[PDB]
Amino acid sequence: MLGNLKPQAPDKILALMGEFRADPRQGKIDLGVGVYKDATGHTPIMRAVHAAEQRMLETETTKTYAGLSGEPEFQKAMGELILGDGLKSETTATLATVGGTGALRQALELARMANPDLRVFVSDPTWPNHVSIMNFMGLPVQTYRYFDAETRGVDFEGMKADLAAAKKGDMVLLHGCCHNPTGANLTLDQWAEIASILEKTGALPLIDLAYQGFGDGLEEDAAGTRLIASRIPEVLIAASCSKNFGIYRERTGCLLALCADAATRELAQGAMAFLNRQTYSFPPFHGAKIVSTVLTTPELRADWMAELEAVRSGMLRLREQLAGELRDLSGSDRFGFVAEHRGMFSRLGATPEQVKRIKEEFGIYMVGDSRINIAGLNDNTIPILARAIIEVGV
Amino acid sequence: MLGNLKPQAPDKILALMGEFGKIDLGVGVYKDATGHTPIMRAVHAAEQRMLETETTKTYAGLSGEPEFQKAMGELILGDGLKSETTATLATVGGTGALRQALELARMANPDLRVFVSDPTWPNHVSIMNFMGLPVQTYRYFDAETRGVDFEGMKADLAAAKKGDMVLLHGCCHNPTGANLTLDQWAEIASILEKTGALPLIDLAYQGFGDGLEEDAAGTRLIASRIPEVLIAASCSKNFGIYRERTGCLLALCADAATRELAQGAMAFLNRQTYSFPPFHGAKIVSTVLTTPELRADWMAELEAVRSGMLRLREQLAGELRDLSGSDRFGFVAEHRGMFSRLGATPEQVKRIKEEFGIYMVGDSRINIAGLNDNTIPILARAIIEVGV
Numbered sequence: 001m002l003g004n005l006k007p008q009a010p011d012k013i014l015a016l017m018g019e020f021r022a023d024p025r026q027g028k029i030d031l032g033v034g035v036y037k038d039a040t041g042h043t044p045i046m047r048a049v050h051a052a053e054q055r056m057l058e059t060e061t062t063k064t065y066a067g068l069s070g071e072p073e074f075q076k077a078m079g080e081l082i083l084g085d086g087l088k089s090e091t092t093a094t095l096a097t098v099g100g101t102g103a104l105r106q107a108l109e110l111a112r113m114a115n116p117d118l119r120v121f122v123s124d125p126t127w128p129n130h131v132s133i134m135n136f137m138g139l140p141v142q143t144y145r146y147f148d149a150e151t152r153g154v155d156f157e158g159m160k161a162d163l164a165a166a167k168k169g170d171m172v173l174l175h176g177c178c179h180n181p182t183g184a185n186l187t188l189d190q191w192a193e194i195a196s197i198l199e200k201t202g203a204l205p206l207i208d209l210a211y212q213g214f215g216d217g218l219e220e221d222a223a224g225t226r227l228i229a230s231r232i233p234e235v236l237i238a239a240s241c242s243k244n245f246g247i248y249r250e251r252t253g254c255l256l257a258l259c260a261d262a263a264t265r266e267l268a269q270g271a272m273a274f275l276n277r278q279t280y281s282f283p284p285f286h287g288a289k290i291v292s293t294v295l296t297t298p299e300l301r302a303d304w305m306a307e308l309e310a311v312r313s314g315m316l317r318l319r320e321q322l323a324g325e326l327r328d329l330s331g332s333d334r335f336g337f338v339a340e341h342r343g344m345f346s347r348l349g350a351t352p353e354q355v356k357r358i359k360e361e362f363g364i365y366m367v368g369d370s371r372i373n374i375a376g377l378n379d380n381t382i383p384i385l386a387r388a389i390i391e392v393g394v
Numbered sequence: 395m396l397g398n399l400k401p402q403a404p405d406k407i408l409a410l411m412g413e414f415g416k417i418d419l420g421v422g423v424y425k426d427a428t429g430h431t432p433i434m435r436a437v438h439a440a441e442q443r444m445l446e447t448e449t450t451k452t453y454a455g456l457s458g459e460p461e462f463q464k465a466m467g468e469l470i471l472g473d474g475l476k477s478e479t480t481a482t483l484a485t486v487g488g489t490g491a492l493r494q495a496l497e498l499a500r501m502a503n504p505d506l507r508v509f510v511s512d513p514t515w516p517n518h519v520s521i522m523n524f525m526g527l528p529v530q531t532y533r534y535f536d537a538e539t540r541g542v543d544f545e546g547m548k549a550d551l552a553a554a555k556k557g558d559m560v561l562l563h564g565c566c567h568n569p570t571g572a573n574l575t576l577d578q579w580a581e582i583a584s585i586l587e588k589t590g591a592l593p594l595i596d597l598a599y600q601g602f603g604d605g606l607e608e609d610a611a612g613t614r615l616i617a618s619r620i621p622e623v624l625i626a627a628s629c630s631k632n633f634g635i636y637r638e639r640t641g642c643l644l645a646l647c648a649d650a651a652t653r654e655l656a657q658g659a660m661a662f663l664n665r666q667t668y669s670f671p672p673f674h675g676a677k678i679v680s681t682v683l684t685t686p687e688l689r690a691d692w693m694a695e696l697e698a699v700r701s702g703m704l705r706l707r708e709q710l711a712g713e714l715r716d717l718s719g720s721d722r723f724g725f726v727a728e729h730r731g732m733f734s735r736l737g738a739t740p741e742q743v744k745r746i747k748e749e750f751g752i753y754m755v756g757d758s759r760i761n762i763a764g765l766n767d768n769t770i771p772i773l774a775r776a777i778i779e780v781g782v
């Protein structure tokens with residue numbers, strides 16, 4: 001029977017990794033990595049995180065089945081981290097998920113249950129994994145302009161015009177901050193306008209928040225999400241603790257369904273809990289507990305924010321250096337966008353040929369869409385990247 | 395939009411838990427003499443070791459770690475593990491394995507039907523309904539003798555066809571406790587072999603029946619006869635790591651070509667559902683299984699648990715016998731696993747729970763591990779006084 005199986009395409013990421021590994025060049029650089037890495041090219045376990053696991057290992061007396069929708073301590077702590085004082089629990093439904101991806105998958109299954117004729121709008125471009133899930137689910141996908149290939153900024157007029165076409169009940173997916181892969185983000189003013197458009201159209205906003213704390217700061221990064229949450233009655237948020245907590249493999253995420261009234265919140269929470277049980281029963285406990293421990297424990301929380309800020313500030317400094325070097329070598333401020341982008345990613349705006357020229361001639365690897373991970377750069381590699389970009393004619 | 399969400403049916407087994415001289419004999423978790431579900435010695439040691447050796451939490455394997463995959467396959471199939479024709483996927487618990495098992499099967503056969511035992515784990519049907527998969531049932535439990543209605547079972551299974559899937563409980567049948575013998579398994583294998591129906595084996599209690607190896611003997615028989623087999627295994631109970639959410643799906647194929655296909659479709663299945671599988675539980679399991687010292691202690695403790703439970707079944711059966719002279723309750727000591735169905739009518743069941751405080755599942759499924767020397771006669775009285 002299983003021979004009827006249609007061959008599924010590999011992750012590609014691996015192929016990219018293999019491409020790098022075969023290269024016999026000593027000065028080969030890898031900017032294609034999708035996770036954070038410190039100065040020694042390592043993805044460390046955060047101090048607060050290691051402390052939490054140490055504490056859990058000493059406090060846990062059992063591992064019996066726990067909450068189906070996650071633990072209250074975690075739901076509460078997360079909604080507060082994301083929504084701040086604007087958290088109205090009376091109308092907020094929370095579901096612990098298997099990472100941010102799990103949260104996204106669950107948000108799409110929920111919406112389809114509420115509206116079978118659901119149509120989803122995604123930015124151009126967006127996290128490929130978004131389209132993967134949607135295509136797999138067989139949902140009609142529609143695109144809205146977003147990245148301006150010329151300025152490397154946000155084509156806001158195009159985005160607004162495109163979103164205007166959204167009908168009542170349709171879903172529009174927005175990255176709360178640190179747009180992956182572009183690194184180009186909306187200003188709070190641009191968010192305000194988007195909201196007015198969503199009110200007018202009556203489309204349900206699904207916010208993918210996977211990098212809170214990597215752009216301008218924890219609070220600052222949640223600003224857009226918090227504006228949408230106060231203007232629009234129904235909002236779906238997919239939060240990830242993978243990167244901002246550095247617990248990638250633990251698979252900890254969170255789905256928040258903001259509702260118009262309490263009756264609808266019970267309807268949503270029930271359907272969410274139901275969705276978890278029909279997929280894998282209970283959600284992963286470990287990473288979630290680490291997170292609730294860090295946020296509730298004063299000492300730990302403080303140390304976590306402090307470490308995240310050191311990471312954030314460092315990446316920002318790398319951005320300024322690259323932009324500076326690029327300025328000096330270019331004799332123009334053409335590449336200034338690198339210093340404006342937020343998140344650990346940036347799309348350079350180089351065509352596939354230029355991307356291939358950079359690799360062949362300079363030994364620098366990056367995603368085929370010219371996306372680079374700022375965290376893969378340093379005082380020794382920035383000069384090379386600066387030269388490569390210039391020499392290839394970007 | 396969300397106001398259109400219809401209300402859904404809840405997990406009655408877990409609902410009971412919430413509703414809870416209180417005596418809980420519901421949810422399928424192991425309990426010690428003091429009503430606690432401890433963490434196993436090896437597990438605790440494994441975690442301490444992990445906290446000390448892990449230097450990163452970056453993304454890992456989409457199908458799980460090689461260590462976990464190999465260890466699990468050896469645990470389940472013993473020396474019958476043919477890696478060249480075996481695909482393995484790490485999942486979110488045994489339940490996630492079942493869901494993935496159905497997804498994979500449905501991909502390869504959009505017109506598949508699933509045959510389930512009467513009765514069977516409620517979650518089996520809910521998931522199939524959710525997906526919209528047609529469910530057929532085969533006679534399994536014998537209402538009177540409390541054993542297996544083997545002749546009815548073979549009869550119904552004979553009606554399966556190429557493409558159909560038959561779900562079997564590898565050992566310790568939930569919720570009855572009635573189990574097939576090896577001789578019965580060999581007969582089931584011949585039926586399946588002639589019908590071409592793909593068997594899905596739910597292995598959630600390996601080690602709670604007769605022993606680690608004996609509980610996998612049936613699964614190993616089917617595997618050595620049927621070229622294509624699917625096994626959804628759970629580490630929740632036998633490792634006592636319920637909340638960690640760890641299990642795996644094994645796709646046994648007839649050749650390497652299909653193996654690569656299955657492995658690819660399985661990995662894709664995780665990618666489209668939640669990307670990577672949880673790491674913490676799978677790590678504990680592999681560490682225990684690959685560390686001779688830890689493994690030995692785990693088996694020792696699992697052995698202790700298994701023996702104790704049998705002690706209880708015997709003690710309970712005895713109390714009932716010496717409380718009526720009615721040998722009709724002997725099936726209790728004959729059933730193998732953590733559960734056993736008293737056979738009491740639904741009204742009898744709800745009767746005792748609201749006053750005696752003994753909360754058992756509606757179909758009179760009792761978690762034997764909930765009992766103990768001082769709670770046994772109280773349960774025995776109830777049964778006797780209410781009949782059945």
Ligand SMILES: *Cc1c(COP(=O)(O)O)cnc(C)c1O
Nearest residue numbers: 099100101127180210240242669
């Ligand atoms: C990383 C990421 C996620 C979440 O990944 P998980 O590892 O599943 O938490 C979701 N969306 C985007 C855009 C991401 O970059």
Ligand SMILES: *Cc1c(COP(=O)(O)O)cnc(C)c1O
Nearest residue numbers: 281487488489515568598628630
């Ligand atoms: C326990 C059990 C499972 C698996 O539960 P998980 O917590 O998801 O591992 C699956 N099937 C049956 C019959 C079970 O008893």
Ligand SMILES: Nc1ccc(CCC(=O)O)cc1
Nearest residue numbers: 281407420421422423517568
């Ligand atoms: N969804 C779920 C429910 C219950 C259990 C525990 C086993 C049982 O009670 O049958 C596991 C999973």
